[PDB]
Amino acid sequence: GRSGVIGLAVPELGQAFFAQLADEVIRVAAEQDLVVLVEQTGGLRERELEALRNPRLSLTDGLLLAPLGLTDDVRPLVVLGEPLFPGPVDHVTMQHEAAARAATEHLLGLGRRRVMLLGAHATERTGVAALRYAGYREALTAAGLAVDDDLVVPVETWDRSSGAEAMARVLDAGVRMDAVFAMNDDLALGALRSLQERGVAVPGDVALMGFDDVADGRYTYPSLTTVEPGRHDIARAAVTMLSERIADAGTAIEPRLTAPEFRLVVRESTGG
Amino acid sequence: SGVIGLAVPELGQAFFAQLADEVIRVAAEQDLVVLVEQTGGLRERELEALRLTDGLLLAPLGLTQDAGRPLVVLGEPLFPGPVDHVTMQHEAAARAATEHLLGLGRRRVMLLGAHATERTGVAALRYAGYREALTAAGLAVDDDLVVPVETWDRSSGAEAMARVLDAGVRMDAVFAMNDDLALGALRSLQERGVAVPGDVALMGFDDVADGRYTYPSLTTVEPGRHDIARAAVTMLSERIADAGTGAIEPRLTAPEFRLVVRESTGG
Ligand SMILES: [Mg+2]
Numbered sequence A: 001g002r003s004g005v006i007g008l009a010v011p012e013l014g015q016a017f018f019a020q021l022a023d024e025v026i027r028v029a030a031e032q033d034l035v036v037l038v039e040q041t042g043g044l045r046e047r048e049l050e051a052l053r054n055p056r057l058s059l060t061d062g063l064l065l066a067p068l069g070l071t072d073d074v075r076p077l078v079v080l081g082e083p084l085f086p087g088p089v090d091h092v093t094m095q096h097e098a099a100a101r102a103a104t105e106h107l108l109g110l111g112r113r114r115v116m117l118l119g120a121h122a123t124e125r126t127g128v129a130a131l132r133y134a135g136y137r138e139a140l141t142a143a144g145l146a147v148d149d150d151l152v153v154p155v156e157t158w159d160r161s162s163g164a165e166a167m168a169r170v171l172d173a174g175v176r177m178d179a180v181f182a183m184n185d186d187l188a189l190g191a192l193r194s195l196q197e198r199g200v201a202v203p204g205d206v207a208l209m210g211f212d213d214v215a216d217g218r219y220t221y222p223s224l225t226t227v228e229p230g231r232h233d234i235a236r237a238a239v240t241m242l243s244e245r246i247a248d249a250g251t252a253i254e255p256r257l258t259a260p261e262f263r264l265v266v267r268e269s270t271g272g
Numbered sequence B: 001s002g003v004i005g006l007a008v009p010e011l012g013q014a015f016f017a018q019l020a021d022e023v024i025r026v027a028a029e030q031d032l033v034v035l036v037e038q039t040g041g042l043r044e045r046e047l048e049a050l051r052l053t054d055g056l057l058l059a060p061l062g063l064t065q066d067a068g069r070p071l072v073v074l075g076e077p078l079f080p081g082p083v084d085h086v087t088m089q090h091e092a093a094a095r096a097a098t099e100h101l102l103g104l105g106r107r108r109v110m111l112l113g114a115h116a117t118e119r120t121g122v123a124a125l126r127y128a129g130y131r132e133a134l135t136a137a138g139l140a141v142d143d144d145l146v147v148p149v150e151t152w153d154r155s156s157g158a159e160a161m162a163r164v165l166d167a168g169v170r171m172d173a174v175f176a177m178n179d180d181l182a183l184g185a186l187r188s189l190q191e192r193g194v195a196v197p198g199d200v201a202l203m204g205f206d207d208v209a210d211g212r213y214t215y216p217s218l219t220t221v222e223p224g225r226h227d228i229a230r231a232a233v234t235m236l237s238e239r240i241a242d243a244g245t246g247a248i249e250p251r252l253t254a255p256e257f258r259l260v261v262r263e264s265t266g267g
């Protein structure tokens, strides 16, 4: 029976993106007097699967799942990510390709011509990274440039320490860049440290930006250019769609996909 | 699975998101799920959370000295009845933090985040430790070095630090009441070409992840997040099983703290 509880299963709250998304979900849910059970999956496929079927989450009327480990699939469900589940499930994602194209256009518009993509593999990519890469590549082609594999730098985990490590390593290997588009703010700020510790001027020598707008970038030094991917809209769409699914669980709603509008937020790290 | 509630100011605050992550992890170990609510740190919202869950873990910011359901409070001991409190070592940690700055040879130590004349709660305890450290070093408190802020956030730290710097106040160190304040202060110092730690040594309190990757990296205090979370969840589990006998007398837990030395105070 209806409890008025929805679940939110995310990798971990220690990740700013998920903590901020959770804050927005809780706030929106409270407007229709739902409460939120927050589960952590560690981004592990086995834990994501458990969230869908284990009686541990029986108090919930439905689930919002942000999967990372899943890609053989299995409680009303809305997924926060790219299309994944078949059947009567909705997916709410971000405009990865369009935002990556606009970010890259911004850097090229500053007169930078050797733009590094920090957080994607140069030859074999999958999912989100593949969409970001497609936007980046579109922008470079439009500016008469070919991709340079030395400028496409994979990173195992999109975190601060990994971005610092990778940035330091490519700088020390002698790779020449004039701008860096990092796949999230955490990567960007790790990169920022490695740049500053090597005396590289930001943005004088290397313009830098992130993605997500979750690092309180107004207060970094330099302040960090980023992309707001529509967290408020993501939360509202997710909660609204899930409520609809909870009301139609006994039955008929066609699967939907949506991706809210992004906004570039220009700060000091790219010339603001 | 049993069900507990966790009420914090907001998950957008790094310290609370990190603490929430630990609480949820400990609860999962103990076959508990967690309903998370936000209060904005406002008294009325905190009290309303008290008025689904088998027990509640409340982290208030807005309550000061001036239900039939189990309750554990992360904060100063203010509730009567069979309520357990887990309280960080504010005074001792502030004394140790101030001693750390004084040990570098600094003699004009600013306290960023407390009122100069009327303080309550946490700020009063922090001030006491700061004041004792200065007294032991033969120093007196200068009210111009005790700087109040809007709220303990990055914007407020940046705004207050910018105001005192542009005013010409002379300091050689800053002890900020939390890492968010310290990170905001760092920007205001850097944008003015003030060397950290060379001109001004800086530290915070909370050990948020972001402080490892600033340049300089931020010296801080880790107030005991693992013990806070474990103590809280474990005590709540005890009260839930008791179903209000109040046979367990109220407890006061005080987790151990640790100074984390980074580049902003010299390593
Ligand atoms: Mg119960």
Ligand code: NA
Pocket (backbone or CB within 6 Å): B107, B108, B109, B134, B139, B140, B141, B142, B145
């Ligand atoms: Na003094």
